[PDB]
Design a protein around this ligand. Sequence first.
Ligand SMILES: [Fe+3]
Length: 307
Amino acid sequence: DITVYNGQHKEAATAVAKAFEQETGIKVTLNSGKSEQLAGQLKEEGDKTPADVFYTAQTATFADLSEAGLLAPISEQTIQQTAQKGVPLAPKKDWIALSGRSRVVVYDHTKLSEKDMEKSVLDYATPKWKGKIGYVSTSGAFLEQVVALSKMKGDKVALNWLKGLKENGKLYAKNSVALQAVENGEVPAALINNYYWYNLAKEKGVENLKSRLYFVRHQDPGALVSYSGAAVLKASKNQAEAQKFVDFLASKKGQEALVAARAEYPLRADVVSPFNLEPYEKLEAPVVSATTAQDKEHAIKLIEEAG
Ligand SMILES: [Fe+3]
């Protein structure tokens, strides 16, 4: 049996954990929490951690753990299973990316068309979109979007984008609420994450929704994908079962279990989502460095300056 520190959504974790128990017979105990908090705990615990595996919603939390010498190497065959072009790779082959979540523009297709959409996420924060664009400034993915803009286009562009949304956007408390506002005719478009919409579409049927998705693609900052993954702790005294779990997560069966539970993009090339997501390759996600805690602190500062 293994202990898994779980930073991912409990339905994702529970699903893969139950599918693992059926394929192998090995029990999984989850210890859930925020990815950043669990990473801190793993570092404090060090060589006396009870964790066998860290299953995290954000691969960025691995960087610090890897540099602290706290992660075990993973099989090269296992890493290769999800190593599509664009997918973040551990320089020391000591963690693996497993699935992705995408930024997207949702729009009311009875009021706007794909031809009305913009080639960059930058362009939505302009007077053309007053007040026709929803955004969610408190959302974690929104913060990640700001960090990506700062890294890819520089700080002045990121701040200008935020100031543009202040001037031209409609603020919503949550992504779910922004999606409702679009469906309800309150705002014709919004910046959200993909999974909210794909879940609604699976549940209601796409034909019964006013809204559709527009993906900016071509490695625009607004094509940002955030990655979930896993690592084995070097301190684990159950390496064999911990590695078996991570191997399972990268396997066809492990990926099928994940995509049935959550509308995330599988990173295997041979797995299709029952939510009817596009292949990961078609997203044309940018390549960006891991978000550090320092990156997030800085993005919050920019959100503050913008009002
Ligand atoms: Fe959310």
